């Protein structure tokens, strides 16, 4: 319903407001994505930017995996 979507949006806004992280961790290189059952993840902007950062991380890691394996295969 609309009320449940609104309460979920309020919870997400409260969580991302009071968020912090230290000790060698970059925010916007998150360890895990945020799992959701939302129709169109862009309904919640904080979740959309978080999963965008996670997806960027995975694309660059897969490029690096390709380079390591190419060096091994050349050897």
């Amino acid at each position: 319903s609309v009320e449940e979507r609104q309460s979920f949006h309020d919870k997400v806004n409260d969580v991302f407001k009071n968020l912090t992280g230290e000790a060698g961790k970059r925010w916007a290189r998150p360890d895990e994505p945020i799992l959701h059952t939302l129709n169109d993840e862009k309904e919640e902007p904080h979740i959309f930017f978080h999963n965008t950062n996670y997806r960027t991380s995975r694309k660059y890691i897969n490029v690096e995996k390709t380079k390591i394996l190419r060096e091994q295969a050349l050897e």
Binding site: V2, R5, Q6, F8, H9, D10, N39, D40, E41, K42, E43, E44, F48, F49, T52, R55, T56, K59, Y60
Partner: protein, 218 residues
């Protein structure tokens, strides 16, 4: 947000269609009624009655242009010609009547060709307007040197295409457009619900295409 690897909004889509957004506590439109002449003029099932309903308006444009040209010709008349009142009346009425009849002819040809192609193809789309424009512009462009028998069908077809895109297709595409209340398909963002659509005292050329766009009146 912005990376050189990809564009995340190009692959982040809804998996299901959405429900209709509630925009106000009252969901009935308020508007002034359309006159019956324009209601009858919209009907295309009788091609002849469509042309009869629409052509006098297009003849009004030729009447206005002919009255302009007739006054501008009358002002330049020397006194030896202007005092002959029967000859003056037949000259000026000839100019006005030729312009009015030519405009009415072009309008009737356009409306009849439009409704004929409409009824022949069994569906309403932009092809009937393009064909009617090509026919009317070829009627206007006949007998003239040659950029013109191609240029005038193109101009009348372009007028038909602009008419469809601006007056019909874009209002149909934006029927669910809301400027007030909750953002459509983003009701979780929490924008408040007003008791009614906004009351606007607009002119008769600006009327709500959907009952929820605004309430028109005073």
């Amino acid at each position: 947000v912005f990376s050189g690897a990809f564009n995340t909004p190009s692959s982040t889509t809804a998996r299901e269609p959405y429900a209709k957004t509630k925009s106000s506590e009252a969901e009935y439109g308020v508007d002034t009624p359309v006159p019956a002449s324009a209601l009858k003029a919209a009907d295309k099932h009788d091609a002849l009655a469509y042309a009869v309903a629409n052509a006098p308006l297009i003849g009004l444009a030729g009447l206005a242009a002919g009255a302009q040209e007739a006054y501008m010709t009358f002002e330049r008349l020397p006194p030896t010609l202007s005092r002959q009142h029967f000859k003056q009346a037949q000259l000026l009425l000839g100019i006005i009547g030729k312009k009015t009849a030519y405009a009415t002819l072009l309008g009737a040809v356009f409306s009849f060709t439009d409704a004929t192609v409409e009824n022949m193809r069994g569906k309403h789309d932009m092809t009937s307007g393009m064909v009617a424009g090509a026919v009317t512009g070829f009627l206007f462009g006949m007998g003239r040197p040659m950029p013109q028998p191609v240029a005038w069908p193109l101009a009348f077809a372009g007028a038909a295409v602009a008419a469809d895109f601006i007056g019909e297709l874009m209002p149909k595409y934006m029927k669910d457009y809301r400027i007030y209340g909750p953002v459509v398909h983003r009701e979780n963002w929490g924008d408040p619900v007003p008791p009614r659509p906004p009351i606007l005292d607009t002119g008769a050329a600006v009327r709500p295409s959907d009952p929820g766009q605004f309430w028109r009146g005073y």
